[PDB]
Amino acid sequence: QALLKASRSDEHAGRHCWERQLELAVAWNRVDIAESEIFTEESQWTSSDLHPAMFSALVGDKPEFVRLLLENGVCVREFLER
Amino acid sequence: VRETPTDAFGDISFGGLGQKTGKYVRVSSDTSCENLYQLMTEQWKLRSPNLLISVTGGAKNFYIKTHLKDKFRRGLIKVAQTTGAWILTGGTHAGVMKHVGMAVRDYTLSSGSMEGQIVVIGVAPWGVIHNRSTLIHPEGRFPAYYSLDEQG
């Protein structure tokens, strides 16, 4: 968690903080810490903005993380639109 | 203000989990009371009401110290589940109804939804929905798909 807490305040200002923040949770097999922090009740999402994490989670063949992203707001119909 | 025969009828289905199919109907400021109770009771196959519980207040946001909230979510579903209750709320993802939604969602995986579904009725004005065009039709769209958006 201290790694992420350092990770938020950096050179980038914007949407990119949350965007960059996930991909670290993807690259680690660990899901609990990432899930709690990034999936707090206060935060809003959108089913467009989880597509690259979905794609990396499928290719890297990590099952439980795919199930977590699918339970939290990625619709399969929006994901294979093209 | 003048009146006209209504529209926007069909069952809203969400893209996330293919286990819900919530029905959507509209109504005016005043509507026949017997027709309202008939639509609630005989039409949508909802069983008879045994206990009417009304969660109200807030509508913006609030934070619970995360010990009372677990007891609250657990109990407010224990009672509704077993007494065939009807719980009503202002149904919009803003504050108190979000806590009721997390209650229904956190229980709806654990029970498996065999029988006696947790009937949760909701009241929300038809003008103030952000993504309104996703279902508006005079002949309706019955297996309608809908995605979440709250940046607007």
CB contact under 8 A, B15 and A41: no
How far apart, in whole angstroms, are the C-alpha atoms of residue B67 and residue B52? 26
Q: Enumerate the H helices of A1-82 as residue ranges.
A: 2-8, 16-27, 32-38, 51-59, 63-71, 76-79
Q: Which 8-state DSSP code applies to residue A80?
A: T
Nearest to B149 among A46, A76, A77 (CB): A46
CB contact under 8 A, B147 and A75: yes
How far apart, in whole angstroms, are the C-alpha atoms of residue A25 and residue A37? 10
How far apart, in whole angstroms, are the C-alpha atoms of residue B20 and residue B127? 24
Please list, in sequence order, all residues whose beta carbon lies within 8 angstroms of the beta carbon of residue A55, skipping any fewer than 6 positions away.
none
* Contact call for residues B120 and B104 (beta carbons, < 8 A): yes
Q: Pull the structure tokens for residue B81.
A: 């589940």
Q: Which residue of A has its CA nearest to B102?
A: A41
* Contact call for residues A57 and A69 (beta carbons, < 8 A): yes
CB contact under 8 A, A77 and B98: no
Sign of CA dihedral B146, B118, B103, A22: negative
How far apart, in whole angstroms, are the C-alpha atoms of residue A64 and residue B104? 23
Angle at A47 between CA A46 and CA A50, to 5 degrees: 95
Which residues of A fall within a CB distance of 8 Å from B146? none
Backbone angles phi, psi at B98, to 5 degrees: -65, -35
Chain position carrying tokens 């597509």: A51
How far apart, in whole angstroms, are the C-alpha atoms of residue B19 and residue B27? 26
Q: Which residues of B touch A (CB under 8 A)?
A: 15-17, 61, 98, 102, 145, 147-151
**Three-class SS of residue A61?**
coil
How far apart, in whole angstroms, are the C-alpha atoms of residue A46 and residue B127? 22
To test the contact with chain B by mutation, choose from A18, A36, A40, A41 the residue with the greatest count of B C-beta atoms within 10 A, namely A41
SS (H, E, C) chain B: CCCCCCCCCEEEEECCCCCCCEEECCCCCCCCHHHHHHHHHHHCCCCCCCCEEECCCCCCCCCCCCCHHHHHHHHHHHHHHHCCCEEEEECCCCCHHHHHHHHHHHHHHHHCCCCCCCCEEEECCCCCCCCHHHCCCCCCCCEEEECCCCCC
How far apart, in whole angstroms, are the C-alpha atoms of residue B9 and residue B25? 5
How far apart, in whole angstroms, are the C-alpha atoms of residue B96 and residue B56? 8
How far apart, in whole angstroms, are the C-alpha atoms of residue B116 and residue B81? 7
* Contact call for residues A50 and A74 (beta carbons, < 8 A): yes
How far apart, in whole angstroms, are the C-alpha atoms of residue A21 and residue A28? 12
| Strand-pair partners of B86 | B52
How far apart, in whole angstroms, are the C-alpha atoms of residue A44 and residue A24? 19
CB contact under 8 A, A77 and B16: no
**Structural method:** cryo-EM
**Three-class SS of residue A69?**
helix
How far apart, in whole angstroms, are the C-alpha atoms of residue B81 and residue B96? 19
- Using CB atoms and an 8 Å cut-off, which of residues 56-75 of chain A contact chain B? 70-75
Q: Pull the structure tokens for residue B48.
A: 């008879």
CA A75 to chain B, closest CA, distance in angstroms equals: 5
How far is C-alpha B28 from the chain's CA centre?
Answer: 18
Nearest of A72, A29, A74 to residue A52 by alpha carbon:
A74
